[PDB]
Symmetry: C3
Subunit: 599 residues, 3 copies
């Protein structure tokens, strides 16, 4: 009468050993002809977690992951320079990320449905995003999640009060920001790389080029913030032989360095005077409007696909100061040249003009339908077989999308329903158990059992020290058993045998051998987990002592095969399960009459 | 063998669909002659949540809500200007509220009982207040909660180390602070309103009048902080034609504007010189003492009801500077005029003198006993029928009040008890489920069933596509069913039928019709939830295919009425429940022999 | 049919009444010959909680507690002055502690295992440390927890990237920092004490002595920060008669005050010029290196036991400025005098040199193996009887220690296992229930039952108003019963009777007497909790009314003794349990035929 059985408690519902119970509660209700969606096999793990803990690359597809990395870096830059909306709750550094403990901000614009669920089993970043998604506007969650529209009409029409533009491009910006060996620069938008302890040559060249646009008053701040003199010496660069600066817009060969100065550096640093035809530029807004319009002329016709209500013209007026400091009205117009007025939203737009330039230079990012962002049409969700629906309602967090106040919100689907509103679309977020997805653990187990070769139960024999598992595998199986309960033997065996298989399908190590001294502990635990009673008795043989482990009912072929047939979708599937478990069954049956002789 | 049944998991205990289970677990144990307390029908939702999310006005009474709004605005002002105690953990803005992620502060003065419960099912604001209430002094919770004493002796004698005065007054201060169309002023105590994008005329007039007491050194700060020149132009006010300032205390027609300057504006702005009889006031404390004593003379006798140990006299000495800058000792005394010394606690008291002036001008706020703040005498709690007690111990969070270290603390009653201390009073906090209170959902269901008209079960017929519910109602009932378990049919039917009624009592829409293609899914779910087995079989009729949904036991009159009589308080109540459910029973019985013919 | 039974809900799993259920779920599975480890009887409560809430001194040993207090104060000082690692998440004040809501910081160095568990039942400080321990490096947790190595080889070899030195010393630093009556000084490392409202004389003398090393430019900052002029007047000290300062290193009688200035005060204050042989010291680093090397010469040979890679030499070069402001190269060497170069890590090392001086002056701190920090060798954990293991897997949080990336991490053991890694050591953290440990409640109950004297059941009699419990004891027992369930009578009685005993073993008060008016409520609850059915009926006797409480099966000797024998490890233990419960059984049996007569 040992305390193997328990009391429902909160810690016992949170430890990851209890998430494996999902795999073991859902898998038994699926038939081998059950199909798992290809788009659900892997899940969403926010990339902020993946790039810090890359062991989780095991739960995402690598193409999808790189796509997400690209897009988040882009969105991060957009939100970082944006002021009208503040959608990210994360500050990125140098091998590390800070989840900001922002005040809980409740407003006039939040989701009317109260979010009660914590998302406790997901990485820190995924818990954070889901708690945002279920509190605020769906638009916000998609943006933060690093969401790329699928190439098609089967998607959500997202509503909001304020929007950021729909840019979709393949880059490695997030990776570069988080690369551990970076400088934690005053600028949050970009982190220059470090090589051999100093500014990398590739980023150094850009910093020294950028330096042509900063003022002698602040150069020391720049140089000390980045340690440019020392990196220059380290890589053989003479920082004092830089070519004369190009600060005049009518001859300036390259505009790109002034643009970067203005987007990133000017936030903490002041700027060098810029001239137009020898005449000092008077307005900051206009050096920006002119510089980006001339550099990105070919992209002006593309602004309207994201910013349809942005003024565009063929006549830009710059204001400058001549040598006598007179104000000068300068009108610039060229055949076929458009100019754009930014409406003083300077950092936000500089970033976009330059992002589109990269869109034009590098390739498009292409993705499949994201089950966790765009999801399914609600009619498709509703039209869905109950077996298929109930799988997703357990293995995935299930969320709707609905309209209210000309805005769309995401929330746990059951809460949209209790709040009496009708969903438009349904999204799924598969869970992660021990570094593997719940859907992949279930899918692989179904695939490997159905693809398996059949035979007979292992026979009873002598000296069986292995349970076909490794020291690691043993311990995984055995500790999971503690979560057992008294219920039909029939249910417990199917769950135990499937767990046994699920472990072998991932455990590729050598068998670990069991010791006579604890042989009986292993027996007690595995048999008890299947509903068999195990007791200990002692017998005297001459002067010898026999420790008898008595199991009732005993485990032999007729017990496992009869019970699996009773609870299987078909008798043939019961045969496929016992063969996949053959390596594990051998111990289960051969120790069923175990006796430990002390001599 | 689909995964309809589940595993206790944490998310399944948090989603709001699981709170409806309280309604469905408690309601079945109450008799129709059970009474629900009028003071429990509605609950406490902290007003900070109600005014941001007004859909929750559905769970409070409107008179109580306005009373709470008035008092919180008052308490907010008191705590905002207070320095001796910091009781609020919330910063209020412009259509939004920030719950401050303050450090968890544990001291020498906290509740000795460890608070283990999170309050996960309540709005952000209510979770926050309850977590404060269970950590710190009860006094603190009452203050933050916006608590007005009931007019009577049946109340708590609250103990603390430090106290704020007992002011009870009807105003709309909290509403005004949170009104979305306000200016996020440098001052946290008050937010001026915005009309047509500029300072409202009503608040503008006060700001321009206030401006007479600010210094030319800081006027630009004031004008820019509020955009007074532009609001003035917008509404036709000439900001530069303001009457000469009244800065001398012996002739100053109105004291009110200097008082506001000093209470609110002076925090971020400096002040203009103030004189007494032509002689510059030397001490800030004295311009305050004199100004408020003369303006609020009629309220001095009322200070002692809140501040019994505050010096009051008939001789005030002011210190001033004459034209030669000599210090002057000025004694002021008038027949029947009292003066009060503030003890340098200037912002705190200015607020009180002016709050009492409003108390004198506008009406008193009157409330009934607050079940969630003052609660019941512990003897009344103990004396309470077990049926009544067990209702509140499920539907409400239940808290005691007890003495320790000459302080009173609130905590979950069971923790006061496990900590071995004796409660003085017991407070109740009814839960919110889907925007409705748990107590109202239970009370309304009992009232409408007991007030209902009786009849017979609906008869079996043809083409029944409705389940007497709406698309929304369907989905609510059907998804709740997933939480079903194997238990006597007798229990499951009573719970299902009552849930059916509880939904119809709120669902006022048209019936939604069911489609032959999913007809069987609806059948599987509703019958399974009542403990009936549902299986699918196919029959061949000539060349046609019949999909047979077979239910065992079948649902017809004798099954539901026999089971409800077995578990009802009386056979007559079983009849009242089936009639209230007639519209829902029709589908349940008529599809009991459902066959889907494919032709 | 009252709502005594319930629904698993989240709040019902969190309230402390549910932790007592652990005591009542584990205790019944232990035999009276079961032994509880002496090192588990008491637990770890982080001292930051104990010193704010000293009611929890009930769950720690006093020697262990003082040891922990000493070490935390030391570690706090080390981490406070350290910059290379930031291990504490707590800021200490004046009778209070702030748990810092730091950003969740995830990096490249965190535990690869996802921590899903919250630790919800522990004090704020213990929850915080366990959440750190399970996220970051084990080294970090040991440091923050205030961990002293046991005197032996049976310990963990902890790995990390960066380390703090292994100092183990007996002091009262944490107590002094948190003493309520302290000044909240600008310096976080030390808080001077307050006596009679002013700086204490003992700390005042040190502050006025420290003042000899601060600059006339900042003296007013110092004096105002501490109110030294007023404390001086209060205790009769003339602050202006202080002896001339000793600012020159070749004659300076005591080095100790310059060292303190430099370690603590210089952080917010500037410093007075220091000279070497009449020649002004030019480098801050060198006044430090020289001052600490000369003062702590005897400790230099001990640095290497903690800092093995720290340069030590017999020739130190100081740089000074002569009267003509020439730079002077001063070489100092003495027979048998070592000098140490600090490598500019000045505040960190000054603290260590002075901590070792205290190590040399005061005694060593000696502790036993800490079960919660160093734990057991994983082989000892594995080798452990299942009864013993399953006890700790319920009553304690169970954690492993494992290697990854040349670092060691701690995590919930089951998560190390599901993550497929092998533990090195296992640590246990016993839970706290109502101010008592779970292991002590279980151990004491086993000890007092096994040490008890046997007899017979109490006999039925008249006027039994007590249940052998106090008003407090009643309420504890009775409310715990609400957590009851339908299960064999046999299990329920053993749990109820043991809970009854566990309460009497702590409840030393007088019996409280039950009132005829609620006599039946107490009966309903205690019998229902043991699986007995209780119903109410009325009988008419002439004109009188009898309220009949009918219990079936009835509770008399044969019911309790037969059921306890069935579920006991031995029939003799069943007898020991009924005698320990005699005082409680009397009511249970004597009211079994209770009738309330209304006359």
């Amino acid at each position: 009468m040992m305390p193997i059985k328990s009391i429902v408690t909160l810690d016992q519902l949170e430890d990851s050993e209890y998430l494996f119970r999902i795999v073991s509660t859902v898998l038994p209700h699926l038939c081998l002809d059950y199909k798992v969606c290809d788009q659900l096999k892997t899940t969403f793990v926010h990339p902020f977690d993946i790039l810090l803990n890359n062991s989780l690359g095991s739960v995402t597809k690598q193409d999808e992951l790189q796509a997400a990395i690209s897009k988040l870096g882009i969105n991060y830059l957009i939100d970082t320079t944006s002021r009208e909306l503040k959608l990210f709750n994360v500050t990125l550094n140098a091998g590390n990320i800070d989840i900001i403990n922002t005040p809980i901000n409740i407003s006039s614009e939040t989701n009317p449905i109260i979010n009660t669920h914590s998302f406790y089993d997901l990485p820190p970043f995924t818990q954070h995003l889901l708690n945002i998604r279920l509190t605020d506007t769906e638009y916000r969650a998609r943006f933060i999640g690093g969401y790329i529209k699928p190439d098609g009409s089967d998607s959500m029409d997202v509503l909001a009060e304020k929007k950021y533009p729909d840019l979709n491009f393949d880059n490695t910006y997030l990776f570069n920001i988080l690369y551990k060996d970076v400088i934690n620069a005053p600028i949050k938008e970009f982190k220059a790389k470090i090589v051999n302890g100093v500014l990398s040559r590739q980023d150094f060249d850009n910093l020294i080029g950028v330096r042509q646009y900063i003022t002698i008053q602040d150069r020391p701040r720049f140089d000390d913030a980045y340690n440019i003199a020392d990196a220059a010496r380290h890589y053989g660069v003479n920082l004092n032989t830089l070519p004369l600066p190009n600060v005049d817009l009518t001859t300036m060969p390259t505009y790109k360095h002034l643009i970067m100065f203005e987007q990133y550096f000017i936030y903490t640093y002041d700027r060098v005077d810029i001239y137009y035809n020898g005449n000092k530029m008077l307005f900051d807004d206009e050096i920006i409007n002119f510089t980006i319009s001339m550099r990105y002329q070919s992209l002006i016709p593309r602004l309207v696909d994201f910013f349809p209500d942005i003024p565009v013209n063929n006549n830009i007026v710059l204001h400058t100061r001549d040598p006598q400091n007179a104000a000068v009205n300068v009108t610039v117009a060229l055949p076929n040249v458009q100019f754009v007025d930014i409406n003083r939203n300077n950092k936000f737009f500089i970033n976009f003009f330059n992002l589109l330039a990269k869109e034009q230079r590098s390739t498009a990012i292409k993705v499949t339908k994201s089950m966790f962002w765009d999801g399914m049409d609600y009619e498709e969700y509703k039209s869905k077989n109950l077996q298929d629906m109930m799988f997703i309602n357990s293995t995935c967090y299930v969320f709707g999308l609905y309209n209210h106040n000309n805005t769309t919100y995401c929330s746990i689907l059951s809460d949209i329903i209790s709040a009496e509103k009708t969903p438009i679309r349904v999204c799924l977020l598969p869970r992660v158990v021990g570094g593997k997805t719940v859907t992949n653990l279930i899918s692989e187990t179904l695939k490997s059992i159905s693809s398996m070769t059949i035979r007979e139960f292992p026979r009873k024999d002598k000296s069986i020290m292995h349970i076909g598992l490794s020291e690691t595998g043993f311990m995984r199986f055995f500790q999971l058993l503690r979560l057992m309960a008294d219920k039909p033997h029939e249910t417990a065996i199917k769950e135990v045998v499937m767990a046994y298989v699920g472990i072998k399908l991932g455990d590729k190590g050598s068998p670990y051998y069991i010791r006579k001294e604890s042989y009986q502990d292993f027996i007690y635990l595995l048999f008890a987990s299947m509903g068999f009673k195990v007791t200990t008795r002692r017998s005297i043989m001459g002067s010898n002592n026999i420790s008898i482990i008595s199991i009732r009912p005993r485990v032999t072929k007729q017990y496992i095969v009869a019970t699996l047939m009773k609870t299987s979708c078909s008798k043939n599937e019961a045969e496929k399960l016992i063969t996949s478990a053959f390596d594990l069954l051998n111990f289960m049956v051969s120790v069923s009459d175990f006796r430990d002789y002390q001599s």
